[model samples]
Target chain A: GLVPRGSHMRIALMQHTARPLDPQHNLDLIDDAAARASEQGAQLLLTPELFGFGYVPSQICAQVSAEQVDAARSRLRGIARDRGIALVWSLPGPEGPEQRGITAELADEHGEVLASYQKVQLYGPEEKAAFVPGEQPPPVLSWGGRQLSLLVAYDVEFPEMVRAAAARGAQLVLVPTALAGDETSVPGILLPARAVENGITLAYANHCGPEGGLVFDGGSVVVGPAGQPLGELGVEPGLLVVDLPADYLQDRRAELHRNWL
Target chain B: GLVPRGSHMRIALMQHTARPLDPQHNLDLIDDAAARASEQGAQLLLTPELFGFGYVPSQICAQVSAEQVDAARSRLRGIARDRGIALVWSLPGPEGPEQRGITAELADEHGEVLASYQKVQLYGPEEKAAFVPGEQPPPVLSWGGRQLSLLVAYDVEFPEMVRAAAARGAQLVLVPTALAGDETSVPGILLPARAVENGITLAYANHCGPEGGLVFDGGSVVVGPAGQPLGELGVEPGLLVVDLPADYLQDRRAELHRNWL
Candidate 1:
């Protein structure tokens, strides 16, 4: 069997901040980042969590209108089509009775909807009151000859979440996080651990600057199967591109009962 | 009811080289480390994996006799009784059909046996051929004023193994590892991540120098609840003492349904 380990489908992590309730400005930033990433031979550009409308869940539920959410998603699809790169963008969705939940959509380079994932784990008090937890696990879909899945910030903190994606045939797990200044360990320790234990690649894009008064450390990183950062970004916003390795496919479960020794 | 956090039960990790198949020399080293650690206010002294017989599983299973194993264990229990410190030491045991395994025994200060754990995950061809995987999860037991558990080198690398200990009400996890010089990521990345995700403290002891033609990295570490190494040793032989915190109890499962925001 010829496994399509597309090591050439490089990933670009957009480490940038978003303005609260400002979809127009956020969408423009996404469009620009996608264009720049695609020019550098990246097939996917993953932005920070809730980057399209900011991560102020309290205000995102109360202030951002439903029409604005729909409009931002539509523009995101056009950005993917215009820039010839796939995108994973976060937005507000009517997933609950109050329509308060964090949702991420995957748009292909052809402007087609490939998959949608809801943030499985909502963190802290603000997130709990503002958004309902996602009812489903991350969806694994095809893009650029590889299988990938999506997870939000707090979801990746739990080992079970990443294990689930890996078992579901995910070669790469894309995480859009909004980790605070004090949570550097999440990226420095947890992310690499997740990658090594599951034998998969992880690309985490975090909000670099302030969003909703909480400043993130912006330690966005791309970790390979060996649990080392292939490329990492600092406090300033930038894109980090890293190619996956051929051995990222973790079917190590094959013939476990065989005695190799 | 007041729960015991046991911030007083300090731990000491023994980082040193062990001569393969030399039970007399190993027992002397263990006795010395236990005495020194007890003098330094350490209630528990954790030694590296297979410290009594070295980590060469092929030679350990072939050349090391069961009589030597028995004598070494008896001396280990006596060391704990005399020094007033607990001992977590690894050796070969009759845990399988061929009487081969990497077993760690926890001996209390009164020369009493607290618990025994077999290595759940074996690494590489050398280990898989020479040892059998333990059939059960780690045993969580009462120690000092806190509850702790034990895992071997490769077992703690898996999140589910550590998760089992945390769920069984263990505030601290002690691992006896023999990692190679190039495998520094196991201690630097995986161990700390396990502590944070399980919300428990972890003390890992590794062989500091060469044994059986393989050079081992002496990166022993004691990690706190926040996933930071409270004390870490370099590639030289030494002992690292660190205290556990009161908040190390991971009963955070208690108010998950509460909306504090």
Candidate 2:
């Protein structure tokens, strides 16, 4: 398929620094970042995993009703459509046997639900106790003639999962993370490796600062087709912009992986 | 610093099958398979760059005097004498700029002189004209708890040339090469990416392959500490073995810069 041309696809990774148990404050921050990204001509924006509620040790997300979370998603969808930009967000929602857990969803420029992927690999005892693990792999979706996929935190660490998505024909992979601590190595190291190995672009958005007494390190990144880093955001709430060239996918794939094997 | 017990290092890569000028006798069939990687064991091996070696434009490499071409060095004196293993190899020749072209060399068991970097980056027209381009980056020598570092054909693809060696304080960077046929993606893609991203390990080898009339896909490769395949070989000739615990200069400076930048 031919890629959409405006020279490049302006993308932004919203490091929505969430506060534990503070939905109103988190929403305010997310709204401001989304608005800022749209203002900067971002065709699409990505927020970290479990942004509606912080990834705190407490099961605060489980306490929130499904309708309430749905309302939040609806609000974000409206913003995406009203702003005319693609947006991806994650929340704890009802799925399968679990009463509480994680589900990542993507919304197109028109606020239409595009695609979603549940968190397949949850970390730690806290998460296992609080959420039901997802069974399916993350799949790519279509947008402006481009293929994009979604994976929450911890999903990017696995080589096979990323390989599966790329093998399935994903051009762009969106990773939403609530990674805490001072190291940005998660995105710093792993994101580029994924981009280089799979010959695809990667958009990683992360949370920053303290949330529920746990410090978060926001090191969001955007890797280009050649596996070179295009842009990065520090531990601050801001919009990081990058362009997805129309021919970048074809160019990189051609340059890197000539043989199928 | 000595490498930890049971610590031995070797590197490797994949230099796809080359189209030999003399297809019948080219040994292209011998280098077709991927270097077997032992998922359960610690042994690491790689293939050469252009193993076919049948593509020399005229016959300059073949015509060069054997004395002028024999320039391989004995860099790993301590490792070979103490630990006992082959170090590196490349085009045979005396160590000097006067020698334009020669066969690659390889380090023998017990840290003796093994191989050399012979064929430089051979692409279109320049490959036909220039005799050789050995004025590239100097080989790095490093030793530590993990004695490792080596260069293969086209080691100077990017900043990783110095970075890879500097990062690990590589004792040597081996280069085995063959400059012909379809260009392998390893130099353009893997070299710079691997060097800048990973702090330690630098072994690059190549093979001489058929370009115009002459054939010489010299099998070459790069290995790392604990013997990991950094790059593969092409269709050609030669053997390389390296042992550790070799000392490598650890430079945290580059890594920090990478993080900040």
Candidate 3:
């Protein structure tokens, strides 16, 4: 018999610094954060976008290489298995025929090579110049009986991506961002909107502090369906834990009014 | 002379209707609709909640004070002044102390009336018994050079109402409503959302439409900041119109997004 009253889900938001042009150092940083989250009793540890290697390498296939991305994935899988905590991290994936980019993945403590969601939309001039676009969306996966979905930075701006994920039975979304912080318009404004509009719990992890000549606000946060902020990391590098009610998701979904765009 | 994009200041939304209870003979069926809107339309026109005046002693507003309700506001002020363009109309207030009460007013179209929003949240039981709630928000005056705000019916469905008005600088509000229709829950979904998220755009208006004994869906409406649509009546009544950009009697001073409560 299971204890059934108010269902709760605990999540940890990690605002870590990623080294530019260096995958090895970043991996080590991720490993340390994972260990810290597990010790703090987090069910899942979230890392930023392109955590293995910082976003937008000089060369995808040449500089970072598919093999290097795979190695980073393997390291994360091993970390998950060793620490007994699930990890959600993003990395550059194999270039498609058109050479658009994909988000490589490693899911769960078992280190099963779960599905990879290629980024469908490439952002601006720099992104369009380097990467190819992904054709399909990431599949929502059931882990520990919870519906979980994942996405990268740019994907969150578009309504279709988050709506598609929620439609696919995703109750919680994990996002990893590499946004250079400013006064406004950080994950602070956007992520909370996404959580409220989609009726899903969102755990967004951002690269905080400084790297690659850019300073980040390090405002990583967890938000409920009502767009309420559960926890946040403001310019700090550490683990932020939050206990959430599972029914919060269902309660919000029931009151949904807008037809998904 | 001026910029190529010429601005049309005064506008309003008509939320009135002709219903089953003497839809053919009710005075509001003919007089209220066409009369009120045409009167105030120097800028725009709006009307009562179920302007048909059918929600009387028989059905909706069991009190049945038809003569008392219709005689309160000057029905031909807009038309007599030759300002026949836009105005809002409503039968009674929908909830609280003024439930099944007086039809609200917004004679001048000016920004002085900031923070005027009507009842986006309806008092269902009381409204059903014989109460009316003002529907329009504050007018965004700025016509000729002033600001005001307004809202009506279910327009309070999301933060857009207050956001749109506040963005333009409405200081006062007007409302109009007629709730005995489908009870679709759009008001519950939109009103509070609008009030909690915006800075300006006071709203107010009337309630009109049929309930049990053939009540009129008084065309409730609003005059918001920058001339955004507040609310109006739609039944085949008399001419109705309202002036635009007139100063209000009070100023709005509420903190934006104070709390969800």
Candidate 4:
């Protein structure tokens, strides 16, 4: 179900400092981060959830238009193409009012849409009122010779969600999260446990600094199949690049299968 | 549904130094630990997996007899009654060859067997060869005006197993593990994650020191619903007493239900 074991895949995570309701500013930030990550030999770049629209769910749902979503998606795809790196980002969907939710999109090196997934778990009152929960499971696709999947924000916090993705043959689970400064256990305990338990690599990109009345926690982390930290960012906004071992899933799956049998 | 929240329940974990294939010696140690824990105001005491005959799987299966298991259980029940504290311990089952696995039993303060469960997931080649995996899920029972469940070493490592128990209205999940010193992540990361994810208190009791060429890690831990460490012991034989908050499950369930809705 996983890709063949060979060379390592270099991935990058952008712990971005979000600006509330400022799509253009956040796009610029993504452009800079992608360029830096590409320069560091990263094959893929993952950004925080609702990064383009600043993560103010109520405000985003009220203010963002369908045209604006299309414009932002095109611009982000162009950035991936220009930088010659794959990208994963979250934004408000361009669908009609009855089918609105936080959508995560994966773009290939040439800026083609590889896969898209709507968020299944809504966090708080703002999100619950603003968007409808996704009905389907996280979508998985092949990119750069790897099996990858996408989840947004609170969706990645649930172990059942990640386990389902893994059961569907996902080698890497890309997550875009907007977390508060006080919620440290999500990254420290839950994320690592999810990776190890399911035998998959996980990249959690989070928003940092203040946005609206919320103080975003910037401690984004990438964990390997063995639940060890590959790279992590602190409170400041930065780019974290690490190699995802190609043999991780193969080895872990083998071990677990043999033991379970 | 969980029990009504009111007073806290005090629990104790005994990090014992095991003597391989010595059921009498281990029983003496348990007697001492139970008395000490009861004096410290602990309402319940938890011991390591296979505490009676040691955790050497092949040796235990080949050497332990039905009469010996019955003898050990009677002695342990007597210890619980004499100490005036409830007890949780694991040993080989007295059942026939068709139903053999590491069995965990909960005894009342009067030394009566309240609930029992067999191990579901066998750890390695030795365990798989020596014992059969349990067919059913861990059993839940009422104690100290609260709902509790039992899981053996490897079963607790799987998030799905704990999640199922929690969903079955378990407030506390007691685990008796025989972990090697090198397996640090099981206690440091996995156990805590299990507690927090399912919003249940977890008490992990482990063996300390060397036994049958295995260096048991003595770092036993008890974690609260929020993944906060209530009490932890280092690589030594000791007893850890901690209070299980009565409102932990009630508060977490309400918050999760509200947000997940």
Q: lDDT per model, in order?
A: 0.80, 0.55, 0.53, 0.82
Model 1 DockQ class: acceptable
- Which portions of model 1 miss their true places by more than 4 Å? A1-7, A65-67, A94-100, A242-261, B1-7, B63-67, B94-100, B243-261
Structure candidate 4, residue pairs in collision: none
Candidate 1: deviation at residue B48, Å?
Answer: 1.5
B18-38 in candidate 4: lDDT tens per residue?
787898899999999999988
The alpha-carbon interface RMSD of model 1 comes to 10.5
**DockQ, ranked from best to worst:** 4, 1, 3, 2
Candidate 4 TM-score to native: 0.89
User: Top lDDT: which candidate number?
Assistant: 4
Per-residue alpha-carbon lDDT of model 1 for A74-188, expressed as tens digits?
A: 8998999999998988887744326567877788888898988888677877887788777676889777777889988888887767876876788889988888866777888
lDDT of 2 by residue, A160-180 (tens): 456557756888999888888
Residue A152 displacement in candidate 4 (angstroms): 1.5
Residue-by-residue lDDT tens digits, candidate 3, B1-261: 121244444444444444534533443343444444444333544444444444342354554445544443344333323343334444444333335443433554321212334434343354434544334433455433545455544433323344445555654444555555443222322232233333334343334444445444333333333233343334433333333330111111112111100
Better of 3 and 4 by TM-score: 4
Candidate 2 lDDT: 0.55
lDDT of 4 by residue, A75-161 (tens): 999999999999999988878544688899999889998888888777777887888877777888877778899988777666667
Q: Which structure is stronger by lDDT: 3 or 4? A: 4
The per-prediction i-RMS, to one decimal, reads 10.5, 14.4, 14.5, 9.2
Worst 10 residues of 1 chain A by lDDT: A252-261
